[PDB]
Design a protein around this ligand. Structure first.
Ligand SMILES: [Mg+2]
Ligand SMILES: [Mg+2]
Ligand SMILES: [Mg+2]
Ligand SMILES: [Mg+2]
Ligand SMILES: [Mg+2]
Ligand SMILES: [Mg+2]
Ligand SMILES: [Mg+2]
Ligand SMILES: [Mg+2]
Ligand SMILES: [Mg+2]
Ligand SMILES: [Mg+2]
Ligand SMILES: [Mg+2]
Ligand SMILES: [Mg+2]
Ligand SMILES: [Mg+2]
Ligand SMILES: [Mg+2]
Ligand SMILES: [Mg+2]
Ligand SMILES: [Mg+2]
Ligand SMILES: [Mg+2]
Ligand SMILES: [Mg+2]
Ligand SMILES: [Mg+2]
Ligand SMILES: [Mg+2]
Ligand SMILES: [Mg+2]
Ligand SMILES: [Mg+2]
Ligand SMILES: [Mg+2]
Ligand SMILES: [Mg+2]
Ligand SMILES: [Mg+2]
Ligand SMILES: [Mg+2]
Ligand SMILES: [Mg+2]
Ligand SMILES: [Mg+2]
Ligand SMILES: [Zn+2]
Lengths: 64, 71
RNA sequence: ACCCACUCGGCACCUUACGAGAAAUCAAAGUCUUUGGGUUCUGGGGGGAGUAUGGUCGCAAGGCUGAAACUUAAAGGAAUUGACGGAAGGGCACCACCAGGAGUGGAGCCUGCGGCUUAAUUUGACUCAACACGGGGAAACUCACCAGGUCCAGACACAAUAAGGAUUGACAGAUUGAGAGCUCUUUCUUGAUUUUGUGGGUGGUGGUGCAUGGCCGUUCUUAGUUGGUGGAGUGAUUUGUCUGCUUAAUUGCGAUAACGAACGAGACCUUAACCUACUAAAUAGUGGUGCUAGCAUUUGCUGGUUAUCCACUUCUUAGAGGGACUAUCGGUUUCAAGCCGAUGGAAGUUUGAGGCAAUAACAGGUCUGUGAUGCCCUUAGACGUUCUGGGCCGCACGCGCGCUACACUGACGGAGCCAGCGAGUCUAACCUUGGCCGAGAGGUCUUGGUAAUCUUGUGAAACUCCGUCGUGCUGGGGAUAGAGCAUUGUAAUUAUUGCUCUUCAACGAGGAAUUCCUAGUAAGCGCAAGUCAUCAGCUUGCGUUGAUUACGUCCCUGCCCUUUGUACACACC
């Protein structure tokens, strides 16, 4: 599927003295800025990287 | 392919006759002019066009074809 | 005789690489631009040629010595990656076998391909990867073929003809298939729009797919391509990408001089399946009552009522989501990735089925899809086009796809009566209910429907049932053939189709052979869709009935992958 989504594609018969050659042109528009589409390859997997901690510190308790 | 056989018999078309046109009329004793060859009786033709004379046949040619008025 | 330490001198195997080198490798091929222990010999591009000649030897066949002319840009070495093998070792798979299914191959007949035959039987295509393929079911069209008949739609520019007329057109006649003024008879008509020549354009289903684009088929039911930093190698290049294990899979796990990514497989996308949870509806529907039928009547049952009102969303419809991640558990295996069974689940074969799909290849087919196209060809007595008619269908045979049968798990006659994806008429004649008339075909008057609203519930077929047949070419079979009736259609003869009665073939389960396929599948069955004026024995999708046999291997067969050889690299055509 990604195909249908992220790649523009053309062909053009550029015609000439000798003959014609097809031109055929493929582009990848960055799934980053997809605006209203799926905003990256399905292929992706980002984690989120945690946070260092200064944990422990035996109970205690606050009061307002 | 096979190129060319033919029982001969090659044809032309036609010429648009030739002929010097319209003396046909007759202006006589100065400068009275009458008209020899009567003219067509249909609107389409502005009584400037006339009727050829075959045998029996008198027909209108401004009429590309159409209609025979005989006399 | 053994055992052992050590020792000279032998033939060698090994590990390394201080060092060598073009590299393969070499403990000598080492201590060599940091160039010298001693000494012999041989070579100075590839041919010509170890030829000729001379001398010599030998019985001889031959040996030793041994040129040149001319020619010529490579020939050559080691190793790298391809390509290739009538080399070996591993795999993979119903386009391959196993176990079996259902066949074709045997007949009739429907198509296609050959060949033959014709004026013509237009042509492309020939192993899988040509032969119901060109969406190719051709009556005229199509149309390319054959017999003939018209027409320029010959830009344009220059030249000439020429207002005393450059040119157009024609009634009737002849002519012709033709009510074509094609021509010719005759003689008007038109009025610078053509016409005559060149130069130059123009069409063309003419040739070239072996010049091209584009698209497409195959390789591939395959699993492959690649870059970062690090190891090796002077460089080509390798390693990563690998014995094994596993997987549909360069899927992984694992092994490890590699690590860690990417393109491709995956993911993804579509479609089938699951919601008593969500948002909804007279183009969906269910419940209750009103209105009403018929039976039974104590209550009950079974129907009618496109709005007489109430309510709901289990059926249907489709927007939004939830659900499976081989979960659970037990097995077994490098307890690795996986695999096996079992519970459970709508669903646990990639969940089922498809869509999409890397690099690279083929002189694969396609100038007959194109107003894609280079070049050739043709261009008015046209390979342009058009009108008339035949032909593509021609019939001794050969080939491939099929259709129907060989009947009693049947054929027929009543009767039960059950689907799904589809499709349908505006500048118009589509899908068509209902009402008649007609045995049939159909004919006819109406009507609904631009369609979840109407045809339609597509009451389809296979099939289920009560009989009529009686094993006999028989009530199986339906070839061929005559007679009539209809229907599309401007037109049906060479018989478009359809209906009726009569006719009543071969064929008794098919040799050598070869296809297709593992589950809602095989195969039986019909229907919709394409083509379509008319014509399905075709194909594309649909649902109905719904099986016996595997859940293996490598024997065939095809194709991969590794080692190997190589003198191919336009790569075994
Ligand atoms: Mg070295
Ligand atoms: Mg010589
Ligand atoms: Mg090699
Ligand atoms: Mg296996
Ligand atoms: Mg078999
Ligand atoms: Mg058999
Ligand atoms: Mg050819
Ligand atoms: Mg014709
Ligand atoms: Mg000219
Ligand atoms: Mg053309
Ligand atoms: Mg080609
Ligand atoms: Mg091509
Ligand atoms: Mg398969
Ligand atoms: Mg280096
Ligand atoms: Mg490799
Ligand atoms: Mg529902
Ligand atoms: Mg269970
Ligand atoms: Mg070829
Ligand atoms: Mg083409
Ligand atoms: Mg010319
Ligand atoms: Mg044909
Ligand atoms: Mg076929
Ligand atoms: Mg029956
Ligand atoms: Mg009657
Ligand atoms: Mg009989
Ligand atoms: Mg019968
Ligand atoms: Mg049809
Ligand atoms: Mg067909
Ligand atoms: Zn007139």
């Amino acid at each position: 599927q990604p195909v249908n989504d992220f790649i523009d594609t053309a062909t053009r018969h550029v015609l000439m003295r000798q003959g014609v050659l097809g031109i055929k042109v493929k582009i990848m528009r960055d799934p980053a800025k997809s605006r209203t589409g799926p905003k990256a390859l399905p292929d992706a997997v980002t984690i989120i990287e945690p946070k260092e901690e200064e944990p422990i510190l035996a109970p205690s308790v606050k009061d307002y | 392919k096979k190129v060319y056989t033919t029982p001969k018999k090659i044809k032309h078309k036609h010429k648009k006759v030739k002929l010097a046109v319209l003396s046909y009329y007759k202006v006589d004793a100065e400068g009275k002019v009458t008209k020899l060859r009567r003219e067509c009786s249909n609107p389409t033709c502005g009584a400037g066009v006339f009727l050829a004379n075959h045998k029996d046949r008198l027909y209108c040619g401004k009429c590309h074809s159409v209609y025979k008025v005989n006399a």
